[PDB]
Design a protein around this ligand. Structure first.
Ligand SMILES: NC(=O)c1ccc[n+]([C@@H]2O[C@H](COP(=O)([O-])OP(=O)(O)OC[C@H]3O[C@@H](n4cnc5c(N)ncnc54)[C@H](O)[C@@H]3O)[C@@H](O)[C@H]2O)c1
Ligand SMILES: NC(=O)c1ccc[n+]([C@@H]2O[C@H](COP(=O)([O-])OP(=O)(O)OC[C@H]3O[C@@H](n4cnc5c(N)ncnc54)[C@H](O)[C@@H]3O)[C@@H](O)[C@H]2O)c1
Ligand SMILES: NC(=O)c1ccc[n+]([C@@H]2O[C@H](COP(=O)([O-])OP(=O)(O)OC[C@H]3O[C@@H](n4cnc5c(N)ncnc54)[C@H](O)[C@@H]3O)[C@@H](O)[C@H]2O)c1
Lengths: 599, 599, 592
């Protein structure tokens, strides 16, 4: 136990100024002792260290004899997981393994996932998670999410469901109705893995506290005819409900969630069907602490890449011209975001939209159009209708070409050749996923540009080498934005997340691209730097929000960066046994303070 | 179970407009099912109904056989408590009984205390609680409060203590170092009953949720020499610590409390030694959600009585002159508050203070003074020094005489006679407690004024009858203010409680005095109306705070009064068994949805 | 933590030989770490030490800040308890404070009761408990008993009620229907305090573990019209059911208890109407591990009193003649127990029964009787019909006179004088309770005898000095027997408790009466010696039961006494935190 003149768990600390010491004590995480013992404790992911538990810890907590007689450090444990991970037959087996790990030892999980983020991020989420939902069907696991259906339609019924969740301090919810699982379509009740995976990244990459996370899946039926014929499907068996009832369910859901955990609860929508996703985002954006990653996340990730490219094309975003091959969700969102930015660059919403050209399945988006999207309207151009990329490239001679259209190789040798001709360093983004859907590859983009192009894709491509120079193409991964945006929104209790905040994030991501990463064609920082980036974004979001009064955390912390670093998740094993401390010897005595005569 | 087209616990409801229905569902309290069974449940005050549990409830929750085979309604139970209460030998025995009831059946407790508020308020708190601390010494009871000592001096040590408290959603803390227990002095560690009692009133009179309340006692030693000689005293055995250490303890305490439950946590100081109480209030008032009832509560209660008297003396507070016999905490605070009010009445801080005269043990407070309190300075008058009340009454001919000085009968027949002569209806307040310390009695004040005086006292006096007219003198009980101020501060998360808010409260209390109560000499509403008054004050505090942006609850509720009524405590027994509800018959079926051939 | 070559909690142990150490480790109580923390732990009487918890314990168990900042020893806490106790206005108030203590800190409760046994026994049980039930009505307390009614009449319905109890290892149950609470009658559902009190003595006096105890009250209604008319009564508001339903409820109760806790579960009946007491005992005696203290306990304690008298009358129990004034449940029981004792001494059931003279309200018991009790018959004498005791004392000139009949001062100077005349040291027992109803006081017994009488009563009498010689008459308190009989039955899983065992208990109590206590005229051991007496009784019971194969505990423990002492309750606080110990330095290392 600690001396009477010392504080608890304040050993071996860095030299500190009296004022510095107080701030540290005020911000630092405090020890939390669990109520469970023995097997009940070993089965709690958040507490279980497995063989990482020392012998004293085991005897004290009633764990001794329940674990094999071997003792391990967390590094050794992480080693064992990594080894076994790489011996798995395929990516799906690794997914199943990691999911099991998250349910067994949460500290080890995030330890492993954070140490090999590049190697495992596509397993934990990216493309493997959806493949798992589709191929395994119902996956055995501990209750790591909630299923709320169209038959639980009311504030009370959903409130009771949330009440069955084991944590009371929920501050971040990721929801999906599983109608549009990224690159697979309507998977219904099988989509529960998506919210789980996303939240896993919030923690791994954002530093968000795991106890604050809740995966939710809304089941209003499914339109995937296979599932409805599948005798194993475990979701509601009928096509999707879409009337007012669907609208009411979501309304009651947002209400129930905030009624239970408070209005500041961050609710993020995932994999909704495009149309719904945009509507829903528009309906709740200013009424709740909500945001849709597929839409705003994408927009922000790309703009951050374009903003980083700015440092090479020596041309400001407002001094550039963009040509989007594809006019769907991704492209449309990225455009509107590029516009906002331009206006914040001392320009009008006239010369802004006039600098962006969109091409859809029916060629260029001109004005003589019939039945076009209201969002495309402000981008339509008063020029000749055409379906040729090259022709559009020649007419407007854009500064950057962005691909967000299903079409593979839609960016042929000629198109790449043209872009180089008109620009010393042409920006070419092949976003379509997976790589087999890419408008063009890294190799193609570099070679057909003699190595001058600025390339970025949605999926990972191998590093290319041209004329003695090496190139390491990047990826416009949403994971660069949402983690940080989520962290900052939570720690400072931002009432609403607007485009400006996403823009701030993009600018932050761009600012973190090193000069070395830029000398290798990388317009995106390294994935392993997302935790530090997230912290930086959180601090930046704070300054900006306390300035315009939208941050609810009162009062504004003295030192923002220090407060944030003290709030983020720590993969290291913590002490679970109360810290003891002495009192002045005289006051710790057992017995009558003043003598009496015995009866 | 409920039908598939119905909602849970939505039976027999008042006719509602679709829009009205939604608001109701959004605000209404939701059912909460407990995790404990059998004896563990019976021992939980917040869940235990005793024989109020029906037979079905008993069998379901594993309670059957643990309670006698008799079934009771809550009214019958309340009846039994009341009967037994009145058969007790003295007030102390009743206190002990009620304390035991609070630890056995919380619903029944507040049911009983609320139904007979006039008869039991002085038992639960007012004067009996302090007598109990002093006479019983250590009182056996369940752990209903926390002891934090000078030997637990650090954010972490206090954090760990708060962590041992069974509730995580604490929103209201009442603390005391027990140095100045009202009318008894330094009682040290024995003062734990004070915070407990005060919080009990928050709930009984304010409608504050009991689960949000936490009684705390700071033990820095004691100067009461008897206790230090008492072989039974259970507090730290040494005189009070007062250096920087005392200052640090309180600093770490406010930090630890907000670090644990959040910055919005209402922390109210109780029974601190006058000097400390004022300093501490000044140091934290603008840094935390804090307030000191003895100081601000008093000030506000009295001003509310003076404001109600305004409706008779047809003279505004700023069109009146006050003479305080006594210049201590109570009087000084009430003065400064009367000033604030006057300034809000279109006047300056010159003509304001000039309308208030203060008398202390050394006579009138003039200017030729030596070593006087800095707060008295602005009230000192440039007139002749004197010790005669009558003489001061004659010179300034005040409109109201307020007594807040130990001296019994300090308001003699002549003094009362004088006040009547100079004023058609003279305001005379005898605040000193108990009645045996009153500057004068109700009988005295009425008779010696032919029944024209406006009297109010700190302690309860019997109703008097003069010349065929009946009078029911009131009491300037703090309980009229703090409950409501606490409720509103909590529900709307007001960042800081300022004088304006207390003034708003006083004006509210005054506004609730009926015309009948005014025709009987009552300048204070009935004690049984404090719950409704508290709600009214909460709503008023909301409007005012959303207007100047100090209310943190976001967003401002649509209907303030409805939101508040849905938040207040309800003494009625609630259901503890989950509500069940049907799903569409087809979706509730057990079995393969699509036939398969058996293996 | 302990060294790798040391066992846990084995420091400062007495010198022991290899084998002695082994048997000590095999028998010793092991530490048991609780699962509750903070307020939940403080609210468990069996774990709560209150302020006796040290600062470290408080920080470890999450209790710090929940208790005041003082730290006490158990002794210092007992002191505070006794002080408050003696300051109480009356015994009833002392009862209420003790009941609250049992529900607050169990170890302290027993430390206090065990230290001041003679002072508190009558508060915890004896006479005050019945008064508390009658006067207070429903008393506020933690759930410390179970109510089973005529409406929960099925093996399953009772099983579910027993399943609501907080301990699974129940081994002793004391049940009552409250019809005949000693000295007060029918108090219905208010009678739950009796079982609670009886079990409290099981622990305090017998050493029985508290967690094994389960108090129960069967509510089948009440005939106490005042309770039925009282709007504050909390029991079934109707009279007592007695049909096949009652007997069915009792049969289901016995089945449910043994199905739930095992056939070995000891079930003791208390304060039942005499007819039900006897009928039920006769019915379950050899079917379950059961007994009724009022019947057998009484019978046993009194015989132990007589046996002790033998040492002074140089006359064997069989070489004596007894005269019972009053032939109710008490006398008839003692008679039959005495008989059983005579037979085990070599004689037959002939001289035995011919050595006992019974009298009821209608004078002596003459064979010319009409409508008499079946149990009585075998004691009925073929002599003249008289009503005067003197006329009976003078006729059969008995060596002992035993009073068990409401009548106060039934033994007048002429009655006693006649005994002193016929016997050098006449045996005079006035059992009727309370004192104000005693057949005759001690001052009377000794005076009208010239300090030559061997006297005892059911209620206490101050010490009496006569001619320089002091006298300290004893009480025939059932507490000398049931605690030990219970301890022994439980620890060794004795299938059935019969006369032989109670007699055995009787002989052990008698043998513990010192010579000095005998010179002062006290024929019963000191009350403070009951715990040791209980332990010796269990040992003796074990020896007897293993020999006749009625002890189910397998195998017979090696050292009966060491085993017993290792099992009895210990009032001292125990460590609640796990003992830690090292492994070889190399086997604790973390890492590859
Ligand atoms: N950060 C990222 O890297 C990221 C984020 C989100 C989506 N994406 C990828 O972007 C792509 C598009 O996503 P989406 O949600 O906008 O789909 P979408 O259906 O909403 O949009 C597709 C658009 O491309 C047009 N199009 C289709 N076939 C075409 C053809 N042959 N020629 C020309 N135009 C054609 C369509 O008319 C439509 O405007 C996907 O491959 C998706 O995986 C990447
Ligand atoms: N709402 C209420 O009804 C209410 C609230 C708080 C306090 N009180 C009562 O007010 C009284 C004063 O409280 P306090 O905290 O200000 O005590 P205090 O010690 O702070 O003030 C007492 C003042 O009276 C003066 N005084 C004393 N003896 C005097 C005498 N003989 N003649 C003239 N002046 C004299 C002192 O100099 C001092 O200025 C107490 O009796 C207290 O119970 C009533
Ligand atoms: N351990 C003890 O010390 C102890 C144990 C059991 C009983 N007792 C006492 O023994 C007494 C009787 O106990 P019980 O359970 O047998 O009650 P009981 O009703 O069964 O016995 C009463 C007997 O006394 C007879 N009787 C009554 N009034 C009489 C009179 N005026 N003259 C002659 N005979 C009369 C009755 O006919 C009957 O046989 C009680 O006072 C009881 O407290 C003491």
């Amino acid at each position: 136990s600690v001396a009477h003149h010392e504080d608890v768990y304040s050993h071996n600390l860095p030299p500190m100024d009296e004022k510095e010491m107080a701030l540290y004590k005020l911000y630092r995480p405090e020890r939390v002792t669990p109520k469970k013992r023995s097997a009940e404790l070993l089965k709690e992911p958040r507490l279980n260290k497995g063989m990482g538990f020392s012998l004293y810890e085991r005897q004290y907590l009633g764990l001794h004899g329940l674990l094999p007689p071997a003792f391990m450090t967390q590094e050794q444990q992480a080693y064992r997981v990594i080894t076994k991970l790489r011996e798995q037959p395929n990516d799906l087996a690794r997914y199943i393994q990691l999911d099991g790990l998250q349910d067994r030892n949460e500290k080890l999980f995030y330890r492993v996932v954070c140490d090999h983020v590049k190697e495992l991020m596509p397993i934990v989420y990216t493309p493997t998670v959806g493949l798992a939902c589709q191929n395994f069907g119902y996956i055995y696991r501990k209750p790591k999410g909630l299923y709320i259906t169209i038959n639980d339609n009311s504030v009370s019924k959903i409130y009771q469901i949330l009440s069955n969740w084991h944590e009371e301090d929920v501050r971040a919810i990721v929801v999906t109705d599983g109608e549009r699982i990224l690159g697979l379509g309507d998977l219904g009740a099988y989509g529960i893995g998506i919210p789980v995976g996303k939240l896993a990244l919030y923690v791994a990459l954002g530093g968000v506290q795991p106890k604050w996370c809740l995966p939710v899946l809304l089941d209003v039926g499914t339109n995937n005819m296979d599932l409805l014929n599948d005798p194993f499907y475990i979701g509601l068996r009928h096509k999707r409900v879409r009337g007012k009832d669907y609208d009411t369910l979501l309304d009651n859901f947002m209400k129930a969630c905030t009624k239970k955990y408070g209005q500041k609860t961050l609710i993020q929508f995932e994999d909704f069907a495009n149309p719904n996703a945009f509507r829903l985002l528009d309906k709740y954006q200013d009424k709740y602490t909500m945001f849709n990653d597929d839409i705003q996340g994408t927009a922000s990730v790309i703009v951050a890449g374009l903003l980083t490219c700015t440092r090479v094309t020596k041309k400001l975003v407002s001094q550039e011209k963009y040509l989007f091959f594809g006019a769907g969700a991704a492209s449309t969102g990225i455009a509107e975001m590029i516009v906002h930015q331009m206006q914040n660059e001392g320009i009008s919403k006239e010369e802004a939209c006039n600098r962006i050209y969109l091409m859809d399945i029916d060629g260029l988006v001109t004005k003589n159009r019939k039945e076009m999207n209201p969002r495309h309207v402000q981008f339509a151009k008063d020029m000749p209708e055409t379906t040729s990329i090259l022709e559009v490239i020649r007419a407007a001679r854009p500064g950057a070409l962005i691909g967000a259209s299903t079409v593979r190789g839609a960016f042929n040798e000629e198109v790449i050749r043209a872009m180089a001709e008109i620009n010393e360093r042409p920006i070419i983004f092949a976003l379509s996923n997976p790589t087999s859907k890419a408008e063009c590859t890294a190799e193609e983009a570099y070679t057909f540009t003699n190595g001058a192009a600025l390339y970025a894709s949605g999926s990972p491509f191998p590093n290319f080498e041209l004329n003695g120079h090496t190139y390491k193409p990047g990826q416009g991964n949403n994971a660069y934005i949402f983690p940080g945006v989520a962290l900052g929104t939570i720690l400072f209790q931002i009432r609403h997340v607007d485009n400006d905040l996403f823009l701030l994030a993009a600018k932050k991501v761009a600012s973190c691209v090193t000069e070395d990463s830029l000398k290798v064609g990388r317009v995106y920082p390294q994935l392993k730097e997302i935790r530090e980036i997230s912290i930086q974004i959180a601090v930046e979001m704070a300054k900006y929000c306390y300035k315009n009064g939208t941050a609810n955390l009162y009062p504004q912390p003295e030192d923002l960066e220090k407060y944030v670093r003290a709030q983020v998740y720590n993969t290291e094993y913590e002490e679970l046994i109360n810290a003891t401390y002495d009192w002045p010897e005289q006051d710790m005595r057992h017995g009558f303070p003043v003598p009496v005569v015995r009866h």
